[PDB]
A paper describes a structure:
Dyneins are a eukaryotic family of ATP-dependent microtubule motor. They are categorized by their two major roles inside cells; cytoplasmic dyneins travel along microtubules and are responsible for both intracellular and intraflagellar transport, whereas axonemal dyneins are docked onto doublet microtubules inside cilia and power ciliary beating. The ODA has a single large dynein motor that repeats every 24 nm and influences the frequency of ciliary waveforms. Here, we report a single-particle cryo-EM reconstruction of three-headed axonemal dynein natively bound to doublet microtubules.
Numbering used by the authors:
A (entry chain K), J (entry chain L), K (entry chain M): 8 to 89
B (entry chain E): 60 to 104
C (entry chain D): 178 to 221
D (entry chain C): 878 to 883, 914 to 936, 955 to 980
E (entry chain J): 2 to 95
F (entry chain I): 2 to 104
G (entry chain G): 15 to 90, 97 to 158
H (entry chain P): 5 to 102
């Protein structure tokens, strides 16, 4: 897995990567990918997340101190945060 | 000994734009390394 | 003089919802064709 | 069509004289019955929708 | 009497092992199989590939669409004719 | 040198009728040789990578001992042809785009 | 939600915004009410629009048009008309009075009729019709 | 019935709002500031989002969230009356939520 | 034509059109003669 | 400016709003708002108060009959009481 | 039991802590938390208390000579004072 930018505890970075990869393996469309990646992590840790999946998107977003993750898998991109 | 606030969160702002698929921070799209990476994937028998 | 009475507090946090969508060149093309069609409908 | 486009009793009377009139035009020349039943049922439905509206 | 005659012709050639028609969401109607423990396999696996491929083709230039598709495995040629009403499958080893 | 051989294969394929394009993309969705510009390249690489891993998982799930050496999607404009060779130390799903209308 | 409701919604939106503004202004609305006979105040119509205007425009549009038709329609197909035919005047009792049918055939003045229908739609074989066998009649 | 991408780009200059829960003055100000952002920097889109949410940050709300792009997907939780999704230039599209 | 352009237009009519409903009464005069007229030719 | 529940004199609810809102714009954190307003509001009207400010709140508190405000202002609501 | 700040006797603090927590567990709504936390602790010691429950609020309070409590427990914020 490829990570370009993150500022958060690595012990749940492993949680993020194992949450995203089985999602990407299972479903076959990219709306339900951003559905699941929020949904299951939302029932895991916190009340609030936001998650983007696609290619060639631009964004500015206020960070969270220990919740900001920018994945990269197989020319398919994921962002999620609080 | 008499005042209170909740545990306040902290937030600044960060950016991200996605371009391409090189392995890691070994390589960067806005540089020359792409050429040499394709070179070391071009000459294997 | 004046006595003591008590009240409570009902705080409504602003309403929230969830929106999910997928932007792709096919979606965009179809919508513009629709926006153009209503233009002809308005014109006619 | 009259099912599609249905003081109240004046209007209901007028509707039903109109239905009588359809049959009178027929006179100058069994499903008769069932058409007439669904018509009257629909008119009563109009009346009870109104009656719940005033609540 | 043209649809069923074409089904009967197409199911009797030298390699064909099954013809399937499936609706929009599912419900494989008019299979051709002597048991139905693997029809449902086709019906819920393949139209994901058909509409995923319509995504791949159409994304490029939106005047474009998809019409057919073939997947040739080692021992099978899964040909799918996808379109708006349904998805259709014909299986054949050459 | 074999680099002349593979470039020669590109002119072998590309000398055929109607063949608009040839490109090679590896398992990490990054193109290696091209024939297109750079952005149609990267969008093919991403799209076809995801699509072909879904299709191979489909065929392997459907039957345990059967894999695919072939893939062919159709347009009304151009018949994209994907070939993969799933192996270790190499899995290079080359993809051609062609159509018999032109010329 | 359906496809012909969009047709009637477009026709009625054409009827209201009659000049062609693309937005329901108050004057065309009062024109529609005055064609229907009503000439209310210029403060109640404000409140009516302000409940229907969501965007702050003081003018309602097709999205708001179908929003109000959607809420009023689907909040409150063949169940009601066949139901309220005669048995829906009885409200889940299954016993219809013969005198209602005699009155119906009385008022509409029909030339020849024999009521053997109710004699030969009798499925409980008592002399009345429950609702399921009532649909079986229909 | 135009017959390429290019005649589509000749027609497609409008900025249709795909879906939006915003006040009309809210809508016009946000819509125009986003079109000025997209026309200002077509190449580098990161600093388009810089400009969009930092203007909305100082003026309208303390939290804001802008996403511009070419092809993507999203699922967000957003407080109501503050969501903008528009198609700009017949290709580029922008999600915007607080 | 003479026996089934009538009897597939006599069954195509619409009697009631779109208080003041007395106009309907007047309206239902008119088409009455219609069917009567058509019927005579078929007879 | 919206008030919800109150029984004070209208002149001092106007005084309360004009004390509170410009103080809200003056500061940026909201411990010190609820020090500054109550100290000022001691020195202006009457010799003892308590105030709370903030978001997502619940409370149960005793107000002398002629002293109670429930602001709902900038979606940072204030409640203040004797 | 996380206590940030107080100046007050300590077995009454024990009553504070348990009459906060079992009140939180018995109840399930935002207002009734501070309803119980007053009412019980009210009728036990003294007729005058004031109590606050929620998250992301804020207040200064004048120092109560011997009776002041603040909690922080399981993303629930509670204040008590005389």
């Amino acid at each position: 897995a490829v990570i370009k930018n993150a500022d958060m505890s690595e012990e749940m970075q492993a949680d993020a990567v194992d949450c995203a990869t089985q999602a990407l393996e299972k479903y076959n469309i990219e709306k339900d990918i951003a559905a699941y990646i929020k949904k299951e992590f939302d029932r895991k840790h916190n009340p609030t997340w936001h998650c983007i999946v696609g290619r060639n998107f631009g964004s500015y977003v206020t960070h969270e101190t220990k919740h900001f993750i920018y994945f990269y898998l197989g020319q398919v991109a994921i962002l999620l945060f609080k | 000994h008499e005042a209170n606030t909740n545990a306040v969160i902290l937030v600044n702002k960060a950016m991200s734009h996605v371009e391409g698929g090189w392995p890691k921070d070994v390589d960067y799209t806005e540089a020359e390394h792409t050429i040499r990476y394709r070179k070391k994937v071009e000459k294997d028998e | 003089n004046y006595p003591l009475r008590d009240r409570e507090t009902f705080t409504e946090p602003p309403p929230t919802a969830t929106v999910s969508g997928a932007c792709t060149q096919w979606e965009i093309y179809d919508e513009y064709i629709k926006d153009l069609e209503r233009q002809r409908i308005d014109e006619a | 069509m009259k099912r599609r486009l249905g003081t109240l009793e004046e209007i209901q009377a007028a509707i039903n004289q109109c239905a009588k009139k359809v049959l009178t035009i027929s006179k100058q020349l069994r499903r008769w019955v069932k058409a007439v039943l669904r018509l009257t049922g629909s008119v009563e439905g109009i009346k009870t929708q109104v009656g719940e509206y005033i609540r | 009497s043209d649809i069923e005659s074409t089904l009967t012709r197409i199911q009797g050639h030298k390699g064909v092992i099954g013809v399937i028609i499936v609706n929009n969401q599912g419900v494989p109607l008019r299979s051709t199989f002597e048991h139905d423990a693997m029809t449902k396999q086709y019906a819920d696996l393949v139209p994901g590939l058909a509409d995923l491929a319509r995504n791949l083709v159409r994304d490029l230039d939106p005047q474009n669409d998809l019409e057919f598709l073939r997947i040739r495995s080692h021992k099978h040629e899964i040909m799918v004719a996808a379109k708006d009403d349904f998805v259709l499958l014909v299986i054949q080893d050459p | 040198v074999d680099i002349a051989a593979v470039d020669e294969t590109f002119k072998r394929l590309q000398s055929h009728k109607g063949v608009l394009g040839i490109i090679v993309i590896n398992a990490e969705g990054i193109a290696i040789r091209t024939t297109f510009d750079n952005d149609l390249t990267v969008q093919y690489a991403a799209l076809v990578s995801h699509f072909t891993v879904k299709a191979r998982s489909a065929v392997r799930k459907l039957d345990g001992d059967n894999d695919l050496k072939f893939l062919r999607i159709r347009s009304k404009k151009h018949e994209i042809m994907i070939a993969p060779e799933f192996e270790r130390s190499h899995e290079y799903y080359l993809v051609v785009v062609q159509d018999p209308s032109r010329e | 939600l359906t496809d012909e409701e969009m047709d009637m919604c477009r026709k009625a939106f054409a009827m209201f915004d009659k000049d062609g503004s693309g937005t329901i202004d108050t004057k065309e609305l009062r024109t529609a009410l005055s064609a229907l006979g009503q000439n209310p105040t210029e403060e109640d119509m404000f409140v009516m629009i302000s409940q229907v205007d969501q965007d702050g425009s003081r003018c309602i549009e097709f999205k708001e048009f179908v929003r109000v038709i959607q809420i009023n329609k689907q909040m409150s197909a063949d169940t009601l008309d066949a139901f309220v035919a005669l048995g829906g005047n009885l409200d889940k009792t299954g016993r219809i009075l013969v005198d209602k049918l005699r009155s119906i055939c009385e008022e509409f003045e029909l030339t020849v009729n024999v009521d053997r229908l109710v004699k030969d739609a009798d499925r409980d074989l008592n002399g009345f019709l429950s609702y399921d066998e009532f649909r079986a009649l229909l | 019935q135009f017959e390429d991408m290019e005649a589509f780009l000749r027609v497609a200059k409008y900025t249709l709002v795909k879906f939006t829960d915003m006040h009309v003055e809210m809508k016009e100000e946000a819509m125009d500031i986003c079109i000025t952002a997209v026309e200002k920097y077509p190449n580098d889109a990161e600093k388009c989002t810089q400009m969009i949410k930092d203007q909305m940050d100082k003026k309208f709300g303390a939290p804001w969230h802008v996403v511009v792009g070419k092809g993507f997907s999203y699922e967000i939780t957003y407080e109501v009356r503050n969501l903008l999704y528009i198609y700009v230039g017949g290709r580029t599209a922008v999600l915007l939520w607080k | 034509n003479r026996v089934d352009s009538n009897l597939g237009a006599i069954s195509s009519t619409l009697l009631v059109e779109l208080e003041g409903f007395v106009e309907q009464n007047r309206f239902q005069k008119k088409q009455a003669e219609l069917l009567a007229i058509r019927n005579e030719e078929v007879r």
